[PDB]
Design a protein around this ligand. Structure first.
Ligand SMILES: CCCCCCCCCCC(CCCCCCCCCC)(CO[C@@H]1O[C@H](CO)[C@@H](O[C@H]2O[C@H](CO)[C@@H](O)[C@H](O)[C@H]2O)[C@H](O)[C@H]1O)CO[C@@H]1O[C@H](CO)[C@@H](O[C@H]2O[C@H](CO)[C@@H](O)[C@H](O)[C@H]2O)[C@H](O)[C@H]1O
Ligand SMILES: CC(C)CCC[C@@H](C)[C@H]1CC[C@H]2[C@@H]3CC=C4C[C@@H](O)CC[C@]4(C)[C@H]3CC[C@]12C
Lengths: 114, 517
């Protein structure tokens, strides 16, 4: 069935960069949109980025546009979210979501800054 | 007598147009673009594509109502643009319709192994058996569907038209049921599937135009309706109304499907609560998939029936004028319909679908219809301003040069704007000069008023495009951009096909042809 596992998040120095890898399962990664979601302990969910199922167009939220790069690997069926410039604003748990909207949500991972 | 029977009716034209259009529409919706764009974005892309197709259909309807004739864009290009350019427009249109029908049949056959749902009946000696050549990869397939469709078309215009009407009405009813079910389910779940984070139109008009670029080829059915103009009792009234109602119904259906079923197909597949199963129990998507496959297959069959009824008409017009042997001209004394030309086109399409794969047939189809549209646009511009018959005495020549300049400028700026491989420094100059000459030509064209002899061409009355100075130019620009966007893969094949056409023309068609012999 459709299942999403992601890794890469962890403690990093302020102003650094990160890449989060979200591995698909039970379906080719090409056939659905893939989004990313955020949520700090004191806030509700916050959409991050959204690749396009067919073709490789990407869109980002206002607070993060340009900073993050979302890519995809059709061979390994993995979706990568690259953080070029981090700041404490983004300190939160990260999720990767399938479908045009938030239909399925991954297990999750945590990222923090120092 | 040797005359086509004017037995068709406005409802029958609407049915033909809607079926032929909906087939390609469902072919696209099953394709890659459907999941490329969001639901609402896909719907507005279909809306813009429908607006552009209406820009083309206004010219089609005007030229068909004023001078109705089975030649379609061939006949029109032959009167305004002149001979030669017609033989290239008509030849390209023939290739386009033939390869559309062949691709539709080749796609239908494997999925139609059983009644519906893609099940297999395990036939013998009709299944796909690759040719065991030493280095040959062809995979011949059952192409009997083309033979049955050709037999239907050869059986008359009312009989084939009635069968097409039955199939397309069944398709439209199942599509309406399919939309009602989708809307009921969405309202039951409160449209929760459309809580899009990025929001609708996530890529802005940039995407809505990018999507509409590939969604434009879903409205390619009105040209067939024009091709069947001779069968209409009073084409002056029906043809424009029929074409309009067909592009309206198709646009509405596409937007509805795109917002209710397509934009939510991911939702029904991914969401763990599975509203389809929760609403219909264990069966769940299994019956929904069956219904969607039924609708798609009915639409594809309707378009397969519709497509092959244009080429015989084009061939009949060509032979009647003289660019093809009289073998294509004569009609059945009993059925009052091209039977020899229809049989030839049917056997050609059958062979093409038998040998070439669908993935190969789809790589050659798109170019003909765009050229037909561009030709018909230039034709309204030339028949409403400088009709080729009969304040300023130089008005005719200045108008002709102005039209030539708008035809050159559209090409220039549509190839500049669609050529990112060129460096920006000369790209800016070329686009600017093309644009300025286009603007100047448009200003001159508007300054010179419409020729009043336009009251004479064809028959008086009929439909006339809304904005003759700007709408046809917009249609030309759109079609030229679409043509240039098409990759070289389809262009090489259409070039060799047109070369074959020019060979036939120079060896026979120029030496023997009415109005030139
Ligand atoms: C006129 C309109 C024309 C266009 C219509 C849309 C056509 C495109 C969508 C096709 C469709 C519509 C379902 C609609 C549901 C109800 C909607 C409302 C109906 C109202 C009346 C029917 O898909 C059917 O199933 C085939 C499956 O291969 C599919 O194949 C291919 O065909 C095309 C090849 O290019 C291509 O499009 C299509 O995607 C392809 O799969 C066929 O299209 C079709 O037979 C999708 O079905 C969904 O497929 C999911 C695949 O994962 C499946 O996932 C589940 O099972 C997985 C294990 O299998 C498991 O791992 C997943 O975790 C789980 O989630 C869903 O259960 C299933 O529902
Ligand atoms: C027939 C006509 C209307 C088609 C016009 C197509 C135009 C609008 C297309 C062609 C190439 C497209 C661009 C290609 C890639 C990208 C990068 C992506 O991250 C955002 C969208 C953007 C910037 C696209 C916007 C739309 C675009 C400019």
């Amino acid at each position: 069935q459709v299942q999403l596992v992601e890794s890469g998040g962890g403690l990093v120095q302020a102003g650094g960069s990160l890449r989060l890898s979200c591995a698909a399962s039970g379906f080719p990664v090409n056939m659905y949109w893939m989004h990313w979601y955020r949520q700090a302990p004191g806030k509700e969910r916050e959409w991050v980025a959204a690749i396009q199922s067919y073709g490789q167009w990407t869109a980002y939220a206002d607070s993060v546009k340009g900073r993050f790069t979302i890519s995809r690997d059709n061979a390994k069926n993995t979706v990568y979210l690259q953080m070029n410039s981090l700041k404490p604003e983004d300190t939160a748990v990260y999720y990767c979501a399938v479908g045009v909207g938030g239909y399925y949500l991954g297990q999750g991972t945590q990222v923090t800054v120092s | 007598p040797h005359q086509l029977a004017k037995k068709l009716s406005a409802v029958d034209l609407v049915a033909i147009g809607v079926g032929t259009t909906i087939g390609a529409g469902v072919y696209i919706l099953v394709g890659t673009v459907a999941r490329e764009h969001t639901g609402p974005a896909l719907a507005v892309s279909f809306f813009i594509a429908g607006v552009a197709a209406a820009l083309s259909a206004c010219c089609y309807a005007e030229l068909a109502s004023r001078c109705p004739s089975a030649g379609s864009a061939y006949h029109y290009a032959y009167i305004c643009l002149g001979e030669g350019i017609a033989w290239l427009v008509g030849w390209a249109l023939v290739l386009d319709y033939t390869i559309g029908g062949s691709a539709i049949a080749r796609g239908i056959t494997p999925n139609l192994a059983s009644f519906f749902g893609g099940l297999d009946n395990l036939p013998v000696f009709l299944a796909r058996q690759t040719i065991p050549g030493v280095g040959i990869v062809v995979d011949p397939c059952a192409a009997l569907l083309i033979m049955i469709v050709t037999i239907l078309l050869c059986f008359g215009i009312k009989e084939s038209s009635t069968v097409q009407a039955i199939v397309t009405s069944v398709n439209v009813c199942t599509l309406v049921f399919i939309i009602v079910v989708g809307g009921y389910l969405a309202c039951k779940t409160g449209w929760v599937g459309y809580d899009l984070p990025s929001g609708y139109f996530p890529f802005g008009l940039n995407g809505i135009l990018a999507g509409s670029a590939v969604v434009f080829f879903s409205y390619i059915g009105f040209d067939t309706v024009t091709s069947t103009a001779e069968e209409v009792k009073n084409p002056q009234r029906d043809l424009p109304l029929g074409i309009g109602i067909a592009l309206l119904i198709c646009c509405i259906l596409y937007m509805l499907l795109s917002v209710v079923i397509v934009g939510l197909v991911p939702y029904y597949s991914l969401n763990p609560d599975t509203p389809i199963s929760s609403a219909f129990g264990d069966s769940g998507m299994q019956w929904a998939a069956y219904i969607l496959t039924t609708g798609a297959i009915t639409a594809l069959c309707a378009s397969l029936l519709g497509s092959l009824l244009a080429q015989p008409r084009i061939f009949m017009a060509m032979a009647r004028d003289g660019l093809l042997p009289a073998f294509f001209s004569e009609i059945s004394p009993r059925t009052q319909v091209p039977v020899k030309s229809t049989i030839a086109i049917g056997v050609l399409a059958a062979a093409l679908a038998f040998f070439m794969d669908v993935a190969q047939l789809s790589e050659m189809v798109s170019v003909g219809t765009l050229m037909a549209f561009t030709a018909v646009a230039v034709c309204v511009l030339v028949l409403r301003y400088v009709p080729p018959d009969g304040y300023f005495g130089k008005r005719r020549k200045i108008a002709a040069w102005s039209i030539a300049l708008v035809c050159i400028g559209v090409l220039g700026l549509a190839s500049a704007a669609s050529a990112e491989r060129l460096p920006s420094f000369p790209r800016f100059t070329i686009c600017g000069v093309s644009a300025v000459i286009l603007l100047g030509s448009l200003i001159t064209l508007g300054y010179i008023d419409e020729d009043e002899e336009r009251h004479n061409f064809g028959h008086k009355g009929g439909f006339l495009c809304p904005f003759v100075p700007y709408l046809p130019v917009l249609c030309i620009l759109i079609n030229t951009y679409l043509i240039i966007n098409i990759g070289a893969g389809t262009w090489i094949r259409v070039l060799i096909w047109l070369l074959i056409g020019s060979m036939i023309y120079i060896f026979y068609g120029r030496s023997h042809s009415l109005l030139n012999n």
